[PDB]
Amino acid sequence: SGFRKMAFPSGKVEGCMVQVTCGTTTLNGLWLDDVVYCPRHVICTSEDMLNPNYEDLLIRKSNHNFLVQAGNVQLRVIGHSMQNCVLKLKVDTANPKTPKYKFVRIQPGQTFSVLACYNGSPSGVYQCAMRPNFTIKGSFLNGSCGSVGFNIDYDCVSFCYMHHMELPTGVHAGTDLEGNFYGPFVDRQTAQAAGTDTTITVNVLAWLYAAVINGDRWFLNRFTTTLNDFNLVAMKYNYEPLTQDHVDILGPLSAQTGIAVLDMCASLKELLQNGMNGRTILGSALLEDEFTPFDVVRQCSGVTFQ
Amino acid sequence: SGFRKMAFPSGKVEGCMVQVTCGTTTLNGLWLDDVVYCPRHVICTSEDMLNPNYEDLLIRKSNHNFLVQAGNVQLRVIGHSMQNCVLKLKVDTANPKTPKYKFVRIQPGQTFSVLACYNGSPSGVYQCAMRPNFTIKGSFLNGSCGSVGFNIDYDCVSFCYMHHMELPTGVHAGTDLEGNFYGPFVDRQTAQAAGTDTTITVNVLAWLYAAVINGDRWFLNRFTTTLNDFNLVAMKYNYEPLTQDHVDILGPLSAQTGIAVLDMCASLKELLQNGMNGRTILGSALLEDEFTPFDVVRQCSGVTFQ
Ligand SMILES: *[C@](O)(C(=O)N1CCC1)[C@H](C[C@@H]1CCNC1=O)NC(=O)[C@@H]1[C@@H]2[C@H](CN1C(=O)[C@@H](NC(=O)C(F)(F)F)C(C)(C)C)C2(C)C
Ligand SMILES: *[C@](O)(C(=O)N1CCC1)[C@H](C[C@@H]1CCNC1=O)NC(=O)[C@@H]1[C@@H]2[C@H](CN1C(=O)[C@@H](NC(=O)C(F)(F)F)C(C)(C)C)C2(C)C
Ligand SMILES: [Cl-]
């Protein structure tokens, strides 16, 4: 028992982190096979970042202008190209620590682990959600750019995020590993704000199932509801619409606990309408929405990685 | 910016995890040099665990009765001994992945990362505190015994916890790596309860400093207090006494923010007396006490490990 915000083991990703320097700008890169991936703003000065023309900045650079360090070893760069907002440096050495891996673009509401890094070295690991407004609520300082987000399935690392920037409110924005931003953000130091965020309804229901599995059952009421009536009520409280796909994904938790998804929806509606009355659920005074149905199953059933 | 419950990178510890089986009991072991450390209740049947005589159970076992697997490799056991509540299996192979390491016994209030494991394989990583009542608020299922807790300093893994059991309330108990329990618990399946827990005052102050560093400053009041008057007020709310050593440890955060420790104590007293008035601090509606002063500095200054 117990329920914690749990990150993936970070070992497979720690073996891929390198330091990349161009001129006086240093940040982190991801070394997979003979390619180093990093944010393209490694090629900017501070000056440049106010309004950079990356194509112009990159034509002026050659392979030898990129310094890549893996511990006390420099990797010779033998090719470079820009894909959207990420730079790919071909190096003369394949990373022997390369795990089985994929690049995925995740959907809003999905979670991942971040390995926060500085100068190519890990600081820490924590779990994040891709927010409905395409920000993440991270912990990132200057030097953290090129830190990545990932999921592990058995032996396979799915890389889904590379860190590029911090927005007002101290929330974070970045790209998939093809260098496409999540959300409408651009890699320029200019006024940008996140849209107003929403609560990820399906994740709140997943966490209420986790509460039941752990014996925290006070909020269960004797009612059911329709998906329709649940969504009209939830909309007022800035909750995502719950779709039939969401109901289907909650199936395994519903079956394990014997609580129909629409009965849990009736319990959540009452919590939204009445509040928690000074009570906690799994130690929290607020409803949590950064656990997916899969996160609850992996933690409560003890899924491991090889 | 941002402030997350951050775990240590787990790679150095993932390389030490093995599966240990004795008869039909399987749990996790920690392989360092040519020694595998695991909980001594690997030698029990279910029956035995109600009231085990471990010395008696162990005289009946020989080296070959212990099956140690590291992936698809069996490690030949060539010696065994019991130290307090941990079994040490000498094996014929030194773990080539052995990091620089130490065994430490931590103090109540100190934090560490747990690498939750099943059948010798990692499930996830999360941060815990040794509670004043010598429990941890973990996430552990059957099969998790032998999972360890650790801190990293630069390149050195300080192992401080090995998991043995779950108490009422779904809190957890275990040993240091010399097999001495934290708290008054014993490795027997019998009625045991944790003492009433306390709030780790120095950690609550550390987290209020983290809030200030992140720009969440509403709770700062215009008053100071004496250590004496602060401790008389805090005692009522089941907060630890704050000692002069605690004040001295908060020095670096105090100096960085320009807020004297006793001024922050005055702000905390007002929060304890008046509550948070429907407000949050760093996203939380409750005061957090599982960040140490060192945890705040490592996260807010970007300390890395090699
Ligand atoms: C990243 O560049 C980095 O770590 N570097 C080490 C050499 C460069 C850095 C990470 C940031 C810094 C603070 N916390 C983080 O997450 N990213 C940037 O500095 C980013 C680069 C410039 C401007 N960046 C910003 O994040 C800025 N934000 C914005 O302008 C905006 F979000 F509001 F739009 C600042 C610095 C104001 C937070 C570019 C976008 C190219
Ligand atoms: C641990 O043995 C394990 O993981 N094993 C795989 C083979 C054995 C296990 C971890 C527990 C199980 C549930 N969550 C956990 O953290 N520990 C035990 O089963 C532990 C073994 C017996 C009884 N143990 C208990 O944890 C029990 N608790 C208590 O009796 C007490 F805490 F109340 F005292 C139970 C199983 C009731 C939770 C011994 C202490 C030797
Ligand atoms: Cl909370």
Helix axes B261-274, B227-236, angle to 10 degrees: 30
A6/B123 CB distance under 8 A: yes
Ligand 1 centroid to Cα of residue A55, in Å, is 19
Question: Of A3, A137, A141, which has the smallest distance from its Cβ to B302's Cβ?
Answer: A141
Structure token digits, residue B258: 């320009």
Beta bridge partners of A128: A112
Amino acid symbol at A37: Y
Pairing of strands A17-22, A66-70: antiparallel
Cα B206 to the center of its chain, rounded Å: 18
Q: How many CA atoms lie within 13 Å of B13's alpha carbon, on the beta-carbon side? A: 34
Residue for token pair 């929403």? A198
What secondary structure letter does DSSP report for A179? S
Structure token digits, residue B34: 């040519």
Ligand 3 centroid to Cα of residue A132, in Å, is 21
B1/A283 CB distance under 8 A: no
Beta bridge partners of B136: B172
From B85's Cα to the closest Cα of chain A, the distance in A is 22
Positive or negative: CA dihedral A222, A228, A231, A236: negative
Non-local (6+) Cβ contacts of A176 within 8 A are A103, A104, A105, A106, A160, A161, A162, A182
Backbone angles phi, psi at A171, to 5 degrees: -105, 170
Non-local (6+) Cβ contacts of A98 within 8 A are A15, A16, A31, A32, A33
A300/B141 CB distance under 8 A: yes
A118/B302 CB distance under 8 A: yes
Ligand 1 centroid to Cα of residue A88, in Å, is 20
End-to-end Cα distance, chain A: 23
* CA-to-CA separations, A166 to A22, A50, A215, B83, in angstroms, rounded: 21, 14, 39, 50
Burial class of residue B285 (count of CB atoms within 10 Å of its CB; 0-12, 13-18, 19+): middle
Spell out which residues of chain B touch residue A285, defining contact as CB-CB under 8 Å: 284-286
d(C-alpha A190, C-alpha B211), whole Å: 26
Resolution, Å (one decimal): 1.8
Backbone angles phi, psi at B32, to 5 degrees: -125, 125
Spell out which residues of chain B touch residue A116, defining contact as CB-CB under 8 Å: 6, 302
Closest to B118 (Cα-Cα) out of B10, B16, B9, B17: B17
Say if residues B97 and B16 touch (Cβ distance below 8 Å).
Answer: yes
Question: Of A117, A166, A214, which has the smallest distance from its Cβ to B1's Cβ?
Answer: A166
The alpha carbons of chain B give a radius of gyration, in whole angstroms, of: 22
Amino acid symbol at A3: F
Write the DSSP assignment of A85-120 as a string of letters. Answer: TEEEEEESS--TTPPEEEE-PPPTT-EEEEEEEETT
Helix axes B201-213, B261-274, angle to 10 degrees: 100
Closest to A289 (Cα-Cα) out of A304, A268, A259, A267: A268
Looking at chain B, which residue has its C-alpha nearest residue A166? Answer: B1
Active site residue A41: yes
Write the DSSP assignment of A183-219 as a string of letters. Answer: TT--SSSS---PPPP-B-HHHHHHHHHHHHHTT--TT
Residue for token pair 């690498």? B115
* Runs of H (alpha helix) within chain B: 11-14, 54-59, 201-213, 227-236, 244-249, 251-257, 261-274, 293-301
Q: How many CB atoms lie within 10 A of CB B227?
A: 15
Closest to B225 (Cα-Cα) out of B255, B210, B205, B249: B205
Ligand 2 centroid to Cα of residue A214, in Å, is 16
Non-local (6+) Cβ contacts of B302 within 8 A are A116, A118, A123, A141, A143, A144
d(C-alpha A204, C-alpha A218), whole Å: 16
Q: How many CA atoms lie within 13 Å of A102's alpha carbon, on the beta-carbon side? A: 10
CATH of the domain at A44: 2.40.10.10
Beta bridge partners of A101: A157
B305/A10 CB distance under 8 A: no
CATH of the domain at A270: 1.10.1840.10
* CA-to-CA separations, B155 to A49, A123, A264, in angstroms, rounded: 35, 12, 47
Closest to A138 (Cα-Cα) out of A150, A126, A146: A126
Pairing of strands A86-91, A77-83: antiparallel
d(C-alpha A156, C-alpha A306), whole Å: 9
Range of the domain at A264: 201-301
Say if residues A72 and A119 touch (Cβ distance below 8 Å).
Answer: no
Beta bridge partners of A122: A117
Q: Is the CB of B107 under 6 A from ligand 2?
A: no
Number of residues assigned to chain B = 306
Structure token digits, residue B61: 């076992």
Non-local (6+) Cβ contacts of A284 within 8 A are B285, B286
Question: Chains A and B: how many Cβ contacts under 8 Å?
Answer: 158
Non-local (6+) Cβ contacts of A46 within 8 A are none
Closest to B173 (Cα-Cα) out of B201, B152, B149: B149
Decide: helix, strand or coil at residue B116: strand
The experimental method is X-ray
Question: Of A2, A8, A71, which has the smallest distance from its Cβ to B137's Cβ?
Answer: A2
Say if residues B224 and B266 touch (Cβ distance below 8 Å).
Answer: yes
Structure token digits, residue A1: 């028992």
From A166's Cα to the closest Cα of chain B, the distance in A is 8
The H or E element spanning position A69 is: strand A66-70
d(C-alpha B196, C-alpha A106), whole Å: 43
Closest to B119 (Cα-Cα) out of B29, B42, B27: B27
Q: How many CB atoms lie within 10 A of CB B148?
A: 25
Decide: helix, strand or coil at residue B220: coil
The H or E element spanning position B112 is: strand B111-118
